Amino acid sequence: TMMSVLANALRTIASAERRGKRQVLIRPSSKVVVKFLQVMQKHGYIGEFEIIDDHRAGKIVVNLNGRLNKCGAICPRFDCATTDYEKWMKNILPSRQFGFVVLTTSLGIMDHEEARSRNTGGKVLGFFY
């Protein structure tokens, strides 16, 4: 059965980007998925997206602009202190000049650069570049 909604959605987006598609439909949706997409949008990796209501777990239609290379989830969600950011950056990011690691913290869901500036740790959710 389906165990992780976030992992299912990120795999679907990555495949459509690799195949050169312009739009991709994601099902089912959740609050965590929407927050992850907004972090991507803020940094310019995807376009606009629309959430459709169906009285169940809804669906999302996302517009792609060709700038995304890969996105994926990290399972299980390992704990990350403020001293572990360097280790995660060197292990799953192509370089130190671009790419982001997404975390969930007490202050909300954010990328590693914002989290470090505010001096907070948390759990790793995924990545994109």
Partner 1 sequence: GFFDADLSYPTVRTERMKHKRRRLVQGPNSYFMDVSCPRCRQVTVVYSHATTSVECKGCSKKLCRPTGGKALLVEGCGYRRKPD
Partner 2 sequence: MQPHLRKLRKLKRGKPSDLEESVAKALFELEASHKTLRQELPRFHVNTVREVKVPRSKKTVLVVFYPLRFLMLVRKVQRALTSELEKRHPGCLVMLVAQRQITKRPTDVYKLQKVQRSKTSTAVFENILNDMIYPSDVVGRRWRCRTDGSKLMKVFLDARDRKRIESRLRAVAYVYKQLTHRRVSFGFMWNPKLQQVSTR
Partner 3 sequence: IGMFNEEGENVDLYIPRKCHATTTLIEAHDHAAVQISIANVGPNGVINGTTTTLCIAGYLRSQGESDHAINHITIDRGIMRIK
What is the binding site for partner 1 (CB under 8 A)? 23-25, 50, 52, 54, 59, 61
Any idea how long the chain is? 129
Give me the least distance between CB of 47 and partner 2, in Å please.
6
3 sits near RNA (criterion: CB under 7 A) = yes
106 sits near RNA (criterion: CB under 7 A) = no
1, interface contact from RNA, partner 2, partner 3, none, CB < 5-8 Å by kind: RNA
Q: Which of residues 69 and 104 has its CB atom nearest to RNA in the complex?
A: 104
Contact 17, 64 (CB under 8 A): yes
41, interface contact from partner 2, partner 3, RNA, none, CB < 5-8 Å by kind: partner 2
Give me the least distance between CB of 89 and partner 2, in Å please.
26
Give me the least distance between CB of 78 and RNA, in Å please.
9
Task: Mark the segment that binds partner 3 (CB under 8 A) among 6-14, 38-46, 47-55, 65-73.
Answer: 65-73
Distance CA 65, CA 46 (A): 6
